[PDB]
């Protein structure tokens, strides 16, 4: 109960919530990879890819990016399930696996954006304006929030000769 309603974990939970919602929105927003051939700037996305100058249409073409993205979102769902179950019936310990899942979702998103950076580098020079900063911010938010939630969930480092972990609260 003590590390459940404290503000130090409430703020990290809020950060995780905004990060997860913006990450879920950022999987469809393909506004990060633009390439100028040299009036034919392109748009590269996980699912559908298109180039625009009327005649505009986006469709697929490296599906490992999609697979790791769905794995990351499944991790986010499991973390949210654990976090929700932690609050009710005083499950104070369930906040740790939620942190682990959030951290791993952030890492999976980081690897997905890394593979997409490799893809856009292998295609002129690109430019990140809207969605790459969004994905990097989502990764940073999820990673730091998961790490902080894990650190707050773990009780404390003893700092006393008699004090030890797994004490009676």
């Amino acid at each position: 109960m003590s590390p459940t309603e404290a503000p130090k974990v409430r703020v990290t939970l809020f950060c995780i919530l905004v990060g997860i919602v913006l990450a879920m929105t950022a999987v469809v927003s393909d506004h990060w990879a633009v390439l100028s051939p040299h009036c034919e700037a392109a748009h590269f996305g996980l699912w559908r890819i298109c180039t625009k100058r009327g005649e505009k249409n986006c469709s697929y073409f490296s599906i490992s990016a999609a697979a790791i993205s769905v794995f990351s979102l499944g991790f986010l769902i499991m973390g949210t399930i654990c976090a929700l179950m932690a609050f009710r019936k005083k499950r104070d310990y369930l906040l740790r696996p939620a942190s682990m899942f959030y951290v791993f979702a952030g890492l999976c998103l980081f690897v997905s954006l890394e593979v997409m950076r490799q893809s856009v580098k292998r295609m002129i020079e690109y430019y990140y304006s809207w969605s790459f900063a969004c994905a990097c911010a989502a990764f940073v938010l999820l990673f730091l929030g998961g790490i902080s939630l894990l650190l707050f969930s773990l009780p404390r480092m003893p700092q006393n000769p008699w004090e030890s972990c797994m004490d009676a609260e």
Binding site: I63, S64, A67, L107, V111, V115
Partner: peptide, 23 residues
């Protein structure tokens, strides 16, 4: 999944002997 069709995840199995200290 790479074989079916990313480098730092191989470091997690190295940390397996950090838990060796528990004893």
């Amino acid at each position: 999944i790479d074989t079916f069709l990313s480098a730092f995840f191989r470091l997690f199995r190295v940390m397996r002997l950090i838990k060796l200290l528990s004893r």
